[PDB]
Structures are given as structure tokens and as C-alpha cells.
Subunit: 450 residues, 3 copies
């Protein structure tokens, strides 16, 4: 059969103590609900029906590009009534999986096992065994077969002893859902339609209710507060780190590694402790990343070593280049092959050509630097106090002496030499040597405090 | 009844291999004994009797402000004799809890349970179950009731099998203590009065000895060496991190978070991995703290983002300000709302006014900077080689060009413009433009090494 | 008896996905096989027979100084045939222990227990119990005594139930090895001589085969991929951290500590979270190391505090000196007693004399600085665009003003004073005051954009 999904994402998440709605809280840099959407799609869902409510505007701005059918929940009438709002879109002959935007770790493999165990015209539900089943809905079995679910507040002494609980995740065919949902009543103190009633309605229709137990508890675990979110984050990071390790990436300590995005890697990549990878990061062969580096949306060529406490964003680094320690690459930094970037160096929106070195205490912004240049310590690109930010153009084989200020817009042609302590405001021609003429007083026999 | 406490804090701590005495070793930045004092006070103790001895001078300097009664132990005659020194201060009608300055994690709740289980004229003692009870005093029970305690060196084959051990923590009324303590003899090889004898003396007086078992082993655990101290530190940090998480603080990884002081927080506060919080730190709503930051005695307004590897001490930061990465705030740094502090910037004892930006490679000390100023890269506040450190005063809307040295004492008035590479020694007036006139040699056809 | 060892180190390590051979992958900064060699030597081995093959050239370059007998494996004919290549070197009357260069954690103590349990003319083998023995060779016991080993692919339903497995580690006398090895046939599908056959051959010779069970599973664990390597690294680091803690080093969190080399320490040494120690590091008494520091091949005198995010390599630091935060010591940095090195300061191949201070935004290379000097913020040592790197010599009691460039080769004698913003190219004499004479335009009524 075909498949479509329903994700409940309307909940408030009061225990989060947040102006953000529950499902928008992130795991590895992306909202909980987004993980669930991706799994639903990877599962093969034709449609994804996102049921939303609380913090609606924030949902729509934060998930604008998500390939989903937006189903707004006006009146809060319980989960069965919410899914019923998505029900008119169900095709009779397709399976419908119900998921929760606050249980982000649910896997493709487990859901595939659940679908395949669904009997024709029946229900398949996910259940899980807990040492302490307190608070959750108990799974009721008559002679092996599943007949009902009983919540804590209704459970008798013996029922309270059942260690198998309801995860809320279930699969059934479209027509069955439409059929059973309509027959759910709200004769209760809270006056709302509970999704769990569908188990009894299937049994009363003499349809099979197969439970599939999940081996991994965390997979069906929901984050109701930030302690629980942190537990989920750590599990998810460990899962990501294990994969990379078995693929051949050396992570010196997976427990001190963070991937918040996607990583593309070559072979013999080494990643030291306390490194954070964000956005889209591509690493070529034999790249070495030292402790405390942060890489966000970067492309690193082969044989690049990144020394400790370097921070890179939206940057490109050519093969055999050397970065760090304490280097800052800001958006738009392009380093060609064999370039050197050293301590306390900031590079913004600039191209640095092959073999050029920028080794200490320097700021380069809005600049184009050619090949084999020597950019001295204390060199700074700046602007006049004016309207917009102009560019600095440096050619090949240029020597820029220590503590020189390059005032944009300015051009320094091939082979030029610029002496230490210079203020460059006029264009420098090819093979031109610029020296600052200093004026100094020398005072003899000046004695310092003894 | 009323309550007072006795804390044994005289021990040497040889296995620490330290010139510091055992109890002065820190958990979360404060001495072990200080945790115990605070718990004793929170418990409701009228008096706290600190028994001290080894490293006495260090105790008195390190705990000067502690609201305690200082009881010096001259002769080392065992624990019963030490408590006896505090005994003349016990009121007959008050409970007395005995605690240990090297078991820092003991909680208020557990101690409340112990006190309430104390029978009139009886004793209540804390005990705990261990898989491996080796080395510790075994709890001896006759037909359910506690009669004696037997140490390893006296325990027979069967007694050595008892898994319940003595934590040393006990409660009894004042008069009872005075009474039983006096009756403790020292007829032993080590020739000292053991506190444990009080169990037998109570039983021989036909008084009840109720044991209260502690559920959490770490709570009654003492640190005898630094391995054990580290285990205690990690437990204590995890307890602190859990609280903050349930209160709504997002700590991306509680296992890589350190709080060594007190934290005050608003809502939607996000704290990335490897952050250390020391002293008194106040965080407003929606503050973002990136990886590797250290905050010590700071106040952070709403909506401030602190980028990675920033270190702040005794500083104030206004709302919507931007700090980091690689920023240094030293004591006396005050940043007004909407200010910008960037990489490799050091700020010491300075006020920076609203909307001002200090973005790269800069040192500002002893300075007052107004609103909407632009402080260029490489700008440095300095002094003449003289006696004391003078101040630099900058008004509103001032432009200070790159790599400019401001030589204090100097004043730069509202709207002044200072060109790159300048040395400012004379006061700069309002709307005054200061440009350095450069002298340069230009040499054509200078060829660099090929 | 005497002892010699055989280490199998020829394996490919395909699952590592590396151009490095398996055994050259590092634990704590040194190749797996090197740990095994050191243990073999500490055990008391007269000879160490290194069997090698895959990535042979890399082995020989990476292990050049290892005191071993290099035994090249040309034809890959199974492990029994490999050890047979080392067999002509075995002395009849010595014990021979067989080890694996990919099981790096094997200890001296466990191997001593194995040797001593070896019966005369018999075999002693290491075995270990596993919950899940899947994939490994099962230990077969007849009435308590060890008779054979059966691999997964030959194991029947019941044999597959045996939870005791073969670690491959074994001891026997030289003559016995030579004797049993020769009698190993290769009548199998893979056509290779298996070392395990020696158990059956000993039993058929009516010789005792004693198994010694290992209590610690990780000790006999081999790293076949990088996930497993990381598990081994973490175990090994925790073992190293525990030792240091019990010796009196305060490591605030052993789970965030990394030692990749050797550490020599005094008393009351404090090491904050996320510190990496590499090469040979010596720490005197009461040294404080803050978070995120990296120390590689350094000597730190007594009472030195190293503030956070400092990186030191091949450097020497005198007693009571102050380093950091954000300080860089590059090879050849020597700091005398009571010196100060502050934020965003880089020091390369330079000596800094007693009480001198280098506190902000400074680069010192190839320099000699005397005692009690004041090196201002923004000070830079540089060179002319020439052939080699020349030296800067500064005497005692020199004041070097902010943002001064020192152009080597140059000498600044005792008691000289150098004003801010200076370019020093000529030698500065004793008690000479050098001030830069500035030329400035002042323009009144210059109004900035409103
Ligand atoms: C963010 O939005 C959500 C998320 C959500 N998530 C979950 N779950 C996700 C979390 C969860 C669940 C079951 C069990 N555990 C315990 C675990 C298996 C040990 C869980 O953690 C189910 N249930 C929900 N409702 S439910 O509990 O009634 C579902 C039921 F489990 F079937 F009962 C639910 C409702 C919801 O609001 C939409 C409502 C308004 C229409
Ligand atoms: C720093 O000063 C201390 C701290 C201290 N602490 C402790 N404890 C604190 C530590 C402790 C304890 C019991 C059991 N465990 C094991 C645990 C429960 C698994 C412990 O770790 C008791 N006992 C002490 N003495 S004691 O062992 O005799 C107390 C007794 F447990 F009752 F016996 C004790 C003495 C002491 O010196 C003062 C003496 C000179 C007057
Ligand atoms: C890097 O080089 C190596 C390392 C190596 N290591 C190991 N081991 C080391 C790894 C290992 C081992 C046994 C069991 N476990 C599981 C554990 C005890 C739970 C292991 O992890 C043995 N065995 C090896 N061979 S073996 O498995 O046949 C040895 C046997 F275990 F006796 F069978 C082996 C061969 C090898 O190549 C040389 C061959 C060409 C001559």
C-alpha cells in the first residue's frame, strides 16, 4: 500500500518555560518537528499532515519550506479530534502513520517494522516496556492479544503493574481511520476525544490490534522539558558520532563532539575534542581539526590543518592551507591552496591567493590579495569615515610591512614593497617601494624612576 | 524541638597530598565544609559548632565570615572527645545533629527525615547499603533493632557479610549527648574515645536506636582523596545542571557545564557546551552563551548574545549588546545597550556608551566612551611612563580611526573625527578632524627577491 | 625462566579506512603497537619480535627507534606461520609471550599472572567472559580442563552457547613453540596455519593447557575500527586521570582531561576542565591551569598560573610567572620568574627576563628582553624584506611604548624609554628617550553624517 503521515505539533509545551512552542525547540540545530518530517518523508510518505495550533505564526515562519499540508487546530478538543481534521485528506487504500513532533528520534527502520506488522483492516501500535511505567497509558492484553489502553487515573492495582505502555504511534488504513474516528465520543470529565479509543473500536469491530514493542526507549521518548531535551540531544549526538567513526572519521572523543547539520568527509580526517560542526561542512582527505574549533558552512580542501580555537563561517579553504590557532574566518573568506592564517587574525569577505601568509594580529576585510604575499603583523584594512565599505586590492608577491594601515579604496600592484608603520592611501605601483620617513626626538640621560 | 549542629572539620586529609587541610578543598568553587555549614543553617540550626584542628590558621582565614562557633581541638583523642568539647554548649531540649566537613553533599531533606525519625531520648543514625562494605563500620541488628556498630578490624566472618554501614551522621537531644559522651571510655589500642560507642550506651540505657537508610550513596560520601573529590564534583554539577534545565535554561550538554557560584536567569536562556559560570552571575531573558565562555561576577541584560571563547569578569552588559568571539572583559567593564565588542578586544575598567562599537584588535583601559562611537581596529589607550594610570574621555558620535594611540590623560569631544594611524596626546575639540600628515619615500623599480 | 615476546603487527585494518596501517593508529598520541612494545619491555622481555607486513615502510619510519627485532611477513599464510618466522630466534629455556599490536591496553600485571600460571612444558592462554560471545573463538572445556578452541563458523548449537572466548594471548616455552608450530597443518578452505591449533597439539602431547580469565575486558580488546579506537582512548585516558588524581593532582573533571605523553608534577597542582597535555610536560608545585589550555613539551616552575585558552609549545616558564588568557607560546619561548604574558600575545623563540611584562596585542619573535621591562600593547618585532630572520636585543628596565615597531637587527640598551607609535630601526643607547614627532592637520567644524 501507499503511505501518508500525520504529525501532531499543536501542543503548548508549558514545562519548557518558553515563548517558543514545544516542537520548535532544536535537536542538533534543527526543530524537533523537522526531524519527524524528514523521517516521514524518508519513510516514503506521499502526504505529511502537520497538525498545528499554539505558537502558530512561529511555526509558519520557522517551517516555511517544509513540504507539508498545514492543518490548523482552532478548538482544542483532544488528539482524536485533531487527527480527524486531517482525515478528509486520507486515501482509503493508503496506510496512515500517526507521529508526534515532540518525539524527534523515531526511526525509519522502526516505523517500517510497525507498518509491515499492521494486519489488513487492523491497527498496528508502538508500545514499549518500562521499569517504571508511572504516568503513562498501560497496554491491556487479553490472552496475548491487545484489547485496550488504560491511563494512570483509571488503572486498578493490577493494571498499574503492567510495564508495557502506549507510545501513541500507530498505523492503520485511511478508510479505517475515518471510520473509527467518527465513532469516538467525548463522554469524559475533560470533554475531549481521545485517540486511544480506536483500540477498543477496532476490537469491537473484531479487527486485529497488533502491538510492536520498540527495543530502543529513547526513540519513542518525547521532550516535555529541557532536561529531557538535553537527554535527547546527547543520544542523538552519540548516534551521529558513531556513524562517522565507523565511516573512518577519527573523533578523539565522541562524547565531546557536536554535529548540528550535515558533514561530508574524505579519508583520514582527524577531529580533536570539543569541536562543533554546523550547517553544511565539507572536509577533504587528511584534514586535521584541533580542539575548540567551530566550523559553520565551510569547505576545507585536502591536507588542511586547522589549529586549536579557530572559528570559521561561510568560508572556503584550499588544499594544504594552514589555519590557526585563534584564527577568525568570517563569511566570504576564501583561502587559496598553501595559504597561512595565524593567531589573532580576522578575515572577512576577502580572497587570499596561493601561498600568501597572514600570520599575526591582523584584520583583512573586503579585500583581494594575490599569490605569495607577505602580510605583516598588525596590518589593518580600513575605511574613511564615509557612506559604504570600499575594497582593498593587493597583487602577487607583495610585501606589506608590520602595523601598516591600508585605507580603502586602494590598489597595491605586483611586487610592491611597503615598509613597516605605513599609512597607504594612494595606489602603489608595480615594484614600488614605500617607506615611511620618521621624525624622532632623541633625549640622552633620561632616567626612568628607580 | 530546636536544633543545633556539630561539624567535625579537624582532620588532616593526608591522602589529598596537600598543604591545604581536607575540608578546605573545594566543590563548585567553595570549600567542602562551607557546603555543610550552609546545609546546617538551611536545616534551621540555631548554633553551628565547628570542631577544627589541622591547618587551623588556614581554616580561620578561609572561613572568617562563617556564622559558626569555633571549637579548637588541641589533643587528638578521637571523635567522641572532639564532640564532647562542643557539648557544654548543647541545650538539653534541643536536637543535635553531628556532621562532617568532608561529606559535603548531605542534603536538607535527608537530614529532616533523620531528625523526625529520632525517638524521644533516643538516637537516630544515618546508615547506607553497599555492595562492597569493605573498610567501613558494620551496622549490627538484633531482631530488626539496631544495637551496635562493628568496624572491620573487629568483625567476624558473618559480620563482615553485613552490607549496611555507618555514615557517622547522627541526631540526639543535648542532655543525652552530654550524658552518653561522658560515659565513653578509651580502653583501646589507639587510646581514643569513639563516637560509635553511643549506640551501645543508648541500648544499655534501654533507649531506642533508629537507623535511617539513605537512598543516595553520594550524599553521605566523603572525599578522602582527589579522585573521590572529582567524583563528588561531577555529581554536584549534574545536580545543579538538572535544576537549571527544569527551570527552563537550555544547557546543550549538562555534562559539559560548570556552575561555581550562583546563577540568576530569565527565560529562553541558551548555554552552549563548555561554559563556566563563577561567582554571582545574572542573566536576563533570551541571553545566548556560546561555547567556551567564562563568566565571573557579571550582569547580562536581555537579548545579549555572547559569542564563543569570551571571558568576562566583574562586568556589566546592557540589553541587546553583542560580545565576542574572543573578547576579554576585565573588572570594571560596563557596556551600555546595543554595544558591539568583537574579536581580540580587551576592555578594562571602562564604560562604553549605547550603540558604540569596539570590533577588533583593541585595548581600552580606564576610559569613558560615549554613545554611537566607532572605535577602529588596532586602537590602543595608553599612558606615559610615569607614576599612576590616567583616564581617556571620549564623547558621543566620535570616529577613532584604525591603529590610533590615545595617550591619557586626554579628552575627545562629541563628533570628533580621528584619522587612522594617529597619536592623540592633546585634547580633541567638538567636531574637530585630526589627520596625521605622513611623509613617505617612494622608490620605483625596487625588485624583490625572485 | 627468561622471557621474550612476539607481537603480531602485520594486519591491514581495512575497517579503519586508512592509508595508515591498523597498529600505527594512536592511543594518547602514540601508535597502538608502541604501547604493546613498552608493556613487553616492562614485563622484562629480552627480545621483542615484531612481525610486520602491510604498510611496511610506514612501520619502519614511525617505529625506527623501537628496540625490536624486525620480522617481515612476505606471504600471508596465517598467524601460526607468522610466529613461526620469529621461532628460529626463540631460546629453548625461555618463555615466549604472543601479543597483538592492535590490542594496546594489555597490562604488565595481567601478563605476569598469565606467565606464572603457565605449567612446565604446557601452555597458558588468556581468555575472557562475554555476555555476547558472537564472532569470537569459543573456549572448549572437558571436565574443567581446556582442550580446544572453536571459531563461530564451526561451532554447534551448544558450543555457540559458551561465553568464554579466546583473546589470542598465550605463553609457552621456546622449544615447545618450535615443536608445536612445525606440526600445524593448513588443511582448510582458506589454506592457512592457525595459531589456535597449538591447544589441541599440546593436549594430544598430554601437556596441560591452563586458561587465565581476564577480569578487565578492555585490556584484551582490539581496535578494528575508529569507534572501537575511541572507546579504547577513553578507557586509557580515564586510567591515566585516575592515577594522577590519587597522586594529588586536582583534575576538576577527569572525563574532560587528555594526557598524550608524560606528566611530571609537584603538589597542589590544579587542572581545570578541557586541558590537553602533550609530549613531556613538567609542572612544579601549586601550578594552576585554566580551562582550554594546551601544553606541549613545556616546563612550568612553581606558583605559575596559566589563565584560560593559552597554548604553549616547547617553552620554559619560571616560577610565579603569569600567562594568559589567550596567550601563545611558540617553540623557544623562555619566560623568567615573575614575568607577565597577557591576552593576544604571541612569543616565539625569545627570552623574557625577570619581572618583565608583555600584556596585550603583541608579537615578540627572535628576541632577547631583559628584566623589569614594560612592553606596551601593539608592540611588534619585525624584519626588513630580506634573506634571513634577525634578532632584537632589549636590556633591563626598558619602557617600550604602545604600537611600536622594533625592526631587527636592533639593540635597545638598559633604561631606554621609547614613546608610543615609534619605528625603531637604529640602536637605542642607555637612558635614551626616543619620541616620535607627529605632524597633524586639525580641521575645525568638520561635521560627521547626522
Ligand atoms: C506537540 O504536540 C503534541 C505532541 C504529543 N506527543 C505525544 N507523545 C510523544 C511523547 C510520548 C508519547 C507517549 C509516551 N511517552 C513515554 C515514552 C514512550 C516512555 C512519550 O514520551 C506520545 N502525545 C501527544 N498526545 S497523547 O499523549 O494524547 C497521544 C497518546 F499517547 F496516544 F495518548 C501529543 C500531543 C500533542 O499535541 C497535539 C494535540 C492537540 C492535538
Ligand atoms: C575532616 O574531619 C573529619 C571528617 C570525618 N568524616 C567522617 N565521615 C565522612 C566520610 C564518611 C563517613 C562514614 C562512611 N563513609 C562511607 C560512605 C557512607 C560509603 C564516608 O565516606 C564519616 N568521619 C570521621 N570520623 S569517623 O569515621 O570516626 C566517624 C564515624 F563514622 F562515626 F566513625 C571524620 C573525622 C574527621 O576529623 C575530626 C576528628 C578529629 C575529631
Ligand atoms: C595487526 O595485526 C594483527 C593483530 C591481531 N590481533 C588479534 N587479536 C587482538 C584483538 C582481539 C583478539 C581476540 C579477541 N578479541 C575479542 C575481545 C577479547 C573481546 C579481540 O579484540 C586477538 N588477533 C589476530 N589474529 S587472530 O585473531 O587469528 C589471533 C587469535 F585470536 F588467536 F585467533 C591478529 C592478527 C594480526 O595480523 C597478523 C597476522 C598476519 C599474521
Amino acid at each position: 500500500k501507499a503511505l501518508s503521515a500525520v504529525i501532531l505539533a499543536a501542543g503548548k509545551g508549558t514545562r519548557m518555560y518558553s515563548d517558543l512552542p514545544k516542537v520548535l525547540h532544536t535537536i542538533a540545530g534543527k526543530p524537533m518537528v523537522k526531524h519527524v518530517i524528514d523521517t516521514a518523508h524518508q519513510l516514503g510518505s506521499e502526504n505529511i499532515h502537520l497538525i498545528y495550533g499554539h505558537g502558530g505564526d512561529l511555526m509558519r515562519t520557522h517551517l516555511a519550506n517544509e513540504q507539508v499540508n498545514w492543518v490548523l487546530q482552532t478548538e482544542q478538543l483532544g488528539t482524536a479530534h485533531a487527527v480527524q481534521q486531517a482525515a478528509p485528506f486520507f486515501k482509503d487504500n493508503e496506510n496512515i502513520v500517526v507521529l508526534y513532533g515532540d518525539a524527534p528520534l523515531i526511526t525509519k527502520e522502526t516505523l517500517e517494522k510497525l507498518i509491515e506488522a499492521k494486519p489488513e483492516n487492523g491497527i498496528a501500535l508502538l508500545t514499549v516496556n518500562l521499569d517504571n511505567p508511572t504516568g503513562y497509558g498501560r497496554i491491556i492484553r487479553e490472552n496475548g492479544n491487545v484489547v485496550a489502553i488504560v491511563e494512570q487515573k483509571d488503572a486498578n492495582a493490577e493494571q498499574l503493574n503492567i510495564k508495557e505502555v502506549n507510545t501513541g504511534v500507530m498505523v492503520s488504513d485511511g478508510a479505517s481511520f475515518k471510520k473509527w474516528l467518527a465513532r469516538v465520543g467525548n463522554n469524559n470529565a475533560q470533554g475531549e476525544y481521545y485517540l486511544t479509543d480506536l483500540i477498543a473500536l477496532a476490537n469491537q469491530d473484531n479487527c486485529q490490534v497488533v502491538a510492536v514493542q520498540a527495543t530502543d526507549v529513547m526513540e519513542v521518548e518525547g521532550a516535555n522539558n529541557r532536561l529531557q531535551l538535553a537527554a535527547l540531544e546527547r543520544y542523538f549526538q552519540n548516534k551521529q558520532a558513531s556513524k562517522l567513526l565507523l565511516e573512518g572519521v577519527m573523533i578523539y572523543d565522541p562524547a565531546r563532539f557536536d554535529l548540528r547539520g550535515t558533514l561530508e568527509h574524505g579519508k583520514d580526517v582527524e577531529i580533536d575534542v570539543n569541536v562543533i560542526i554546523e550547517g553544511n561542512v565539507k572536509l577533504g582527505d587528511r584534514v586535521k581539526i584541533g580542539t575548540g574549533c567551530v566550523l559553520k558552512n565551510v569547505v576545507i580542501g585536502n591536507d588542511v590543518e586547522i589549529k586549536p580555537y579557530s572559528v570559521l563561517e561561510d568560508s572556503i579553504v584550499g588544499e594544504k592551507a594552514a589555519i590557526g590557532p585563534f584564527s577568525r574566518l568570517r563569511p566570504g573568506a576564501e583561502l587559496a591552496a598553501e595559504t597561512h592564517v595565524g593567531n589573532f587574525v580576522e578575515i572577512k569577505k576577502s580572497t587570499v591567493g596561493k601561498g600568501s601568509k597572514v600570520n599575526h594580529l591582523t584584520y583583512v576585510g573586503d579585500s583581494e590579495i594575490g599569490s605569495n604575499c607577505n602580510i605583516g603583523a598588525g596590518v589593518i584594512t580600513c575605511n574613511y569615515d564615509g557612506a559604504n565599505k570600499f575594497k582593498t586590492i593587493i597583487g602577487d608577491d607583495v610585501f606589506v610591512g608590520s602595523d601598516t594601515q591600508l585605507v580603502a579604496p586602494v590598489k597595491v600592484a605586483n611586487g610592491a614593497t611597503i615598509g613597516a608603520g605605513t599609512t597607504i592611501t594612494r595606489d602603489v605601483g608595480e615594484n614600488e617601494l614605500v617607506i615611511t620617513r620618521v621624525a624622532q626626538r632623541h633625549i640622552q640621560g633620561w632616567q626612568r624612576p628607580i
